[PDB]
Design a protein around this ligand. Sequence first.
Ligand SMILES: Nc1ncnc2c1ncn2[C@@H]1O[C@H](COP(=O)(O)O)[C@@H](O)[C@H]1O
Ligand SMILES: Nc1ncnc2c1ncn2[C@@H]1O[C@H](COP(=O)(O)O)[C@@H](O)[C@H]1O
Lengths: 216, 216
Amino acid sequence: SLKEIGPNSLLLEDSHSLSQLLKKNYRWYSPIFSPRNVPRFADVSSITESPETLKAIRDFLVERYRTMSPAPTHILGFDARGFLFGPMIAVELGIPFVLMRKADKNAGLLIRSEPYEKEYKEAAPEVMTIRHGSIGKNSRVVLIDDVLATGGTALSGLQLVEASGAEVVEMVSILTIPFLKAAERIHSTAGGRYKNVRFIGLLSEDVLTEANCGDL
Amino acid sequence: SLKEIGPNSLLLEDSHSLSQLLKKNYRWYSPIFSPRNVPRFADVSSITESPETLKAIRDFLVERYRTMSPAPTHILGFDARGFLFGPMIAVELGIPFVLMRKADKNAGLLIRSEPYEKEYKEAAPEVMTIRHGSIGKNSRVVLIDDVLATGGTALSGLQLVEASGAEVVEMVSILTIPFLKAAERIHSTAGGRYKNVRFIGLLSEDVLTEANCGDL
Ligand SMILES: Nc1ncnc2c1ncn2[C@@H]1O[C@H](COP(=O)(O)O)[C@@H](O)[C@H]1O
Ligand SMILES: Nc1ncnc2c1ncn2[C@@H]1O[C@H](COP(=O)(O)O)[C@@H](O)[C@H]1O
């Protein structure tokens, strides 16, 4: 079950078997063994290659949304790693899985997000899209991705769901990085417009040690 | 059930309920409403947004691999749209889902593919990767993606599975484009080295009409 580590920011208790699976199976890589210049790149394939972990994520989130009232009407997953988790939840719930992608990967009439200006020498925000009408008015949308870091991607999702006239149920990630303070930042951004957005993480990055290091 | 439309090229019979679901729900877009310069862009979200179709794909492929002997040991899905289908199969079979990605999206020690030279004014082949050791020797690998067109992506998968010392069970796509002749080409390429690779399609593109056109 989920514990509140900050206002509207919940984390799966570390005694839960999914939490232990994720701590056990997550693998991360240094810049020399990874595609991105971050000190710990959490490799999503360390989760998808572990049938027990993948199944535990699926079971956990499916039971969560089945017993949630009102029930979610849509899952919106973020290109590309959100694609790995969303469909397996959505297929059990009997609801649409919708794709958040860069405009040049997405088809149809689109809606684009409006990211904030980048911070010091920092990391270019990505403009993301959904198809117009993919999310109807008074939809209730679960947003999903593998990792919540700064929250920039998450915020694009929030902006697109709100632009569609819909409600965000919550933002779920497998891994969350408290040190980057995404929930806290999104919760005060734009005058507190997103204060009531619930963030769920399944594992904290602080829990990962060099026992999780995949480096050769 | 599957019919042979060419040597080692099988297509789901059009009386099957999944075939009718796919014919009914698939949506395609012209260049002006799409991210790519092809006359019919098959929008994968037309499938993931249809819970009935997504579930039918899942049920069909899960039952297929459950009753297959020997059983597949791994599913390898192609970035990004293969990611939408693979995990929901793999999670039911209790086997790893492995990611085929461009090198600058993939983590760890990688293996890269070796595409053939491009054809007339034609379409740049993409070098694809898996992590070394993600697929063990005497693995039996199902390859999956949303669309089989020329077969270039598929061939990268074949080259990587064979380079790992593993067997390809088959290449599955939701949509297949007979006019581009991917199976026939892969089957004679490199002296017939891949003659015994089975291709499965769930719907032929010839079956899609302007009743499938998503354009506004
Ligand atoms: N440390 C990390 N390891 C792997 N992926 C990451 C990492 N940090 C961020 N990401 C990816 O970048 C996006 C989240 O970044 P952000 O927008 O800062 O919250 C997600 O789509 C993740 O896949
Ligand atoms: N007509 C199409 N509509 C949507 N996606 C396509 C289409 N043709 C090719 N693709 C994509 O390109 C890859 C297949 O192309 P190919 O390598 O030529 O077999 C797959 O990953 C598909 O997602």
